[PDB]
Design a protein around this nucleic acid. Structure first.
Lengths: 153, 149, 203, 119, 121, 50
RNA sequence: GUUCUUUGUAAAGUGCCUUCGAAGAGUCGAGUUGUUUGGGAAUGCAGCUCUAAGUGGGUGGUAAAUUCCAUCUAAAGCUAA
RNA sequence: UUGACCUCAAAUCAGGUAGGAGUACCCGCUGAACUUAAGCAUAUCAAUAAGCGGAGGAAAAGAAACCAACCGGGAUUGCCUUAGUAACGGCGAGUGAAGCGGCAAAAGCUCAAAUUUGAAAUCUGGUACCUUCGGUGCCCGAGUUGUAAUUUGGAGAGGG
């Protein structure tokens, strides 16, 4: 069908042409072995889902106004930061310590400046394969960006 | 065509002007409507003065710069000088113009004094609903007229 | 905010990175239909400053139109009139090509309302545009009072009446002496100054 | 004579159906006597009686289905208030009175005050 | 792993599961009664002097019937309104815009003896 | 003709029924101005054009 | 006019000091062509080509260069009489 | 092998919506010639008639990338006036506004551009119940390629 042919030749047309150096710094993505430990460390800092957020509020609705607490009954969170608008700001404010960038973003212009912004700001970055796998650790379908601000000792 | 000495006339009637003739037969009819509209409005806007207070303004264009004229709004710097905020002033009947400035001290002090006399002549009613009614005066311009300096 | 970085990047249209994407995307859009559904906007920063929001009810369509002048039909070139009206090959179609793209989309998706449009790509034969459409019957637009104005029936086919951004530009509706002919409506202004006003007591 | 609408609404579904058959039987005999007599005004009473039964029968079934669709969304379209094509497409009172959360604070904090100019 | 083995060079739309309609409301919620019942099929007998002689001679009943009725409904309504047996039904459209039906009974019934029960003679 | 569609014959039946004189009791009604059938048609005098 | 519910350690307004202050691109603009206008070295519009800037840009009814001033903040949208 | 993601389809899928009529007035496109110039080609008739698309009870316009050169005006529209004026035009025939001034009527506004990041706080749908132009609970989904709140230049925000 036409949709099958248009998606195969799109990959074909994008490799016969001379790709400018801003692009093609992708597909040099992290290797299969190294990416295993990267997603092993990132999986320990999953953000709270819609499931476990609800009983967090129940314990915070019985301790703050009842136990005379200052809303500090829950510990300080340790979660992976996601979202293009949020992470880009974290890069500019010297807050990120490791940034993961997907290589298969269809509107590629969203993330072309991310390797250049990370380099000049000095924050380490890693172009990782798969925007779908990035969404899994943030409990979304696609995230395409994954950053870590703080880490347990 | 041209004879019998006469001034050369320029009558622009070479198009289909008869299709666009507007005779104002409703001049008496629409005047009654405006008075009826003004009467039915004032009952809906109970006893507010049917119009906002407007400042004194000097005209440009030296043919007209010798005259003072009612303006649009009270020039945000003037509102603060009178002792009230712009958002509050719009609810008391003080029209506000944010896009004009003050470069004339005589006009500025005349408008500030205009706002001081307005707050000393109003009865602001509380939101509660006590309603000590203050039977309507139909014009805010006939109470504070524009006077030539 | 990443939208500042895309906004500055989209202005470098002749840079190597943008002109390679321009050549790739002009091929892909040409293989598809003339009017087809776009899953996501090509330029997210350009769409969201034109009124687009990323929720249910906002639809993006991609449309291409043929470039060039407008040839007067006049079979075999004959006009049957004065020589001042004999031109056939240099008429310019006072409505913009972006307005024609909006009008073609508004007839296919007649259940939607055209919000705005923007230029995405072009070639010698085709100019490509992406049109932002909203659903007036979706409850997310019927509620959310920032956007429920489109549901009131005076906004039916805004692009067909020149009420869009490109429609008012083609109608010349601006302020100042340069738009004296067209600032309240060309036909209304002309009718105003071509009307013989007569009163009961003649002045 | 003729049947009365209020006398028919006190009967069951089967009684009205059985009465409709008898009126249809009665109408058939009058259409046989009509072709042999110069005038038969009696046939109008029988025909309008059939219309009365069919109106009450249709009203009872419409009322019965209106109760099993009561208090729930997606009622059948002929049991819905038509009232106009355009007014059906218009925004409801809840939707038309919707205001954004930002302008809600402005109306609360700065209502249109009530005042007069005498003193 | 490998891919599927295709013995044909033509790709065709796959057969997807079709879902039966499960509406949340009825289309009309009140079913219309029988448009053409036995009392609407047969309106009135035709009693012209030429039609009357066909009754006692040819054992044929002549009726004026609805224009929407076919020979099946005319046969079914005749045997239900008068409880007789029908041999054949012949129908024509009269020049005045009404349908005329020639209903012939079997040899076990007499058309003259039941036209008397109907009324007219 | 003699092998005609049903639509043609339906208009034939209507034209045959309207080809009648006025009922005599209509002329006796109160405030009546109708004297004769002014829409009378004859096959020899004017054609009905289907 | 009466009456039932307290929204809320909520929201909003104003003073002083300090650091900032993000503001719309094949768009503005220019050339050319056609059309249009009272707009005249080109009023608006459109096709094609070129293609911006950030103490910037548009306008200031004669084309150009140079030096100032005045005035607004485009290329997004809503709204009674 | 299995489970996602992306894109593209299918169904008499669940619920909706578009057509046509009318068209005096309104918003656009398209677009003549008769006529006038005592001929006629620019021009004029006319940015009109006919043709086409799209609305409402009004529509459109509308809160300045404006007018101004002033002792400065201050969204839009309409009327009086400016004015048959400036100007346009085989500078022939003819065409032809706008600022100010008086009056009618008056109303102002918000998105994009920000990190909520100590918690997507946002929303459709389905279902159950209820005080049913909706509300509450629960469950899928939309959405981080950004939905809410805050902010719109008249400012405003982070802070103290």
């Amino acid at each position: 069908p036409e949709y099958v042919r248009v998606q195969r030749q799109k990959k074909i047309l994008s490799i016969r042409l001379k790709v400018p150096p801003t692009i093609a710094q992708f597909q040099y993505t992290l290797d299969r072995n190294t990416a295993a430990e990267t997603f092993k460390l990132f999986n320990k800092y999953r953000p709270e889902t819609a499931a476990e957020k609800k009983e967090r509020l129940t314990k915070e609705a019985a301790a703050v106004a009842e136990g005379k607490s200052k809303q500090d009954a829950s510990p300080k969170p340790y979660a992976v930061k996601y979202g293009l608008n949020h992470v880009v700001a974290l890069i500019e404010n010297k807050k990120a310590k490791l940034v993961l960038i997907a290589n298969d973003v269809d509107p590629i212009e969203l993330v072309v400046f991310l390797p250049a912004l990370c380099k000049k700001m000095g924050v380490p970055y890693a172009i990782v394969k798969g925007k779908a796998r990035l969404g899994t650790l943030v409990n979304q379908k696609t995230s395409a960006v994954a950053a870590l601000t703080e880490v347990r000792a | 065509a041209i004879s019998k000495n006469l001034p050369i006339l320029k009558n622009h009637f070479r198009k289909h002007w008869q299709e666009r003739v507007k005779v104002h037969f409703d001049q008496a009819g629409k005047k009654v409507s405006r008075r009826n509209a003004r009467a039915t409005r004032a009952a809906k806007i109970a006893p507010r003065p049917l119009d906002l207070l407007r400042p004194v303004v000097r005209a440009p264009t030296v043919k007209y710069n010798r005259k003072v004229r009612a303006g649009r709004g009270f020039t945000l710097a003037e509102v603060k000088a009178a002792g009230l905020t712009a958002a509050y002033a719009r609810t008391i009947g003080i029209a506000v113009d944010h896009r004009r400035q003050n470069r004339n001290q005589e006009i500025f002090d005349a408008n500030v004094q205009r706002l001081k006399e307005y707050q000393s002549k109003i009865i602001v009613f509380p939101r509660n609903g006590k309603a000590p009614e203050a039977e309507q005066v139909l014009s805010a311009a006939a109470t504070f007229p524009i006077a030539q300096p | 905010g990443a939208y500042k970085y895309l906004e500055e990047l989209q202005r470098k249209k002749q840079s190597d990175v943008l002109r390679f994407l321009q050549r790739v995307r002009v091929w892909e859009y040409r293989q598809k239909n003339v009017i087809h559904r776009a899953a996501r906007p090509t330029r997210p920063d350009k769409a969201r400053r034109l009124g687009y929001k990323a929720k249910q009810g906002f639809v993006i369509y991609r449309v291409r139109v043929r470039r060039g002048n407008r040839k007067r039909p006049v079979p075999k070139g004959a006009t049957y009139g004065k020589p001042t009206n004999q031109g056939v090959n240099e008429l310019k179609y006072q409505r913009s090509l972006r307005a024609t793209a909006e009008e073609r989309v508004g007839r296919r998706a007649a259940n939607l309302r055209v919000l705005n449009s923007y230029w995405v790509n072009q070639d010698s034969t085709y100019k490509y545009f992406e049109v932002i459409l909203v659903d007036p019957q979706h409850k997310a637009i019927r509620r959310d009072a920032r956007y429920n104005w489109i549901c009131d029936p005076v906004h039916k086919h805004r692009e067909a009446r020149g009420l869009t951004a490109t429609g008012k530009k083609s109608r010349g509706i601006n302020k100042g002496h340069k738009f004296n002919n067209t600032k309240a409506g060309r036909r209304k202004t002309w009718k105003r100054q071509n009307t013989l006003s007569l009163w009961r007591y003649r002045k | 004579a003729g049947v009365k609408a209020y006398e028919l609404r006190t009967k069951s579904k089967e009684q009205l159906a059985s009465q409709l058959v008898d009126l249809k039987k009665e109408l058939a005999e009058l259409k046989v006597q009509k072709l042999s007599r110069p005038s038969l005004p009696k046939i109008k009473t029988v025909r309008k009686s059939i219309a009365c039964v069919l109106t009450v029968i249709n009203e009872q079934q419409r009322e019965a289905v209106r109760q099993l669709y009561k208090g729930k969304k997606y009622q059948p379209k002929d049991l819905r208030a038509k009232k106009t094509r355009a007014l059906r497409r218009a925004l409801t009172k809840f939707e038309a009175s919707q205001v954004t959360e930002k302008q809600r604070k402005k109306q609360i904090a700065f209502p249109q005050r009530k005042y007069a100019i005498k003193a | 792993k490998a891919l599927k083995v295709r013995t044909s060079a033509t790709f065709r739309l796959p057969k997807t599961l079709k879902l039966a309609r499960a509406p949340k409301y009825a289309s009309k919620a009140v079913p219309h009664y029988n448009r053409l019942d036995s009392y609407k099929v047969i309106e009135q007998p035709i009693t012209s002097e030429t039609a009357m002689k066909k009754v006692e001679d040819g054992n044929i009943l002549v009726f004026q019937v609805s224009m929407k009725a076919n020979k099946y409904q005319i046969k079914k309504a005749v045997k239900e309104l008068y409880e007789v047996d029908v041999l054949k039904v012949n129908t024509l459209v009269r020049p005045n815009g009404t349908k005329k039906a020639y209903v012939r009974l079997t040899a076990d019934y007499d058309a003259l003896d039941i036209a008397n029960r109907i009324g007219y003679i | 003709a003699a092998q005609k569609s049903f639509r043609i014959k339906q208009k034939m039946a209507k034209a045959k029924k309207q080809n009648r004189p006025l009922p005599q009791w209509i002329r006796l009604r109160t405030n009546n101005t109708i004297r004769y059938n002014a829409k009378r048609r004859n096959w020899r005098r004017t054609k009905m054009n289907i």
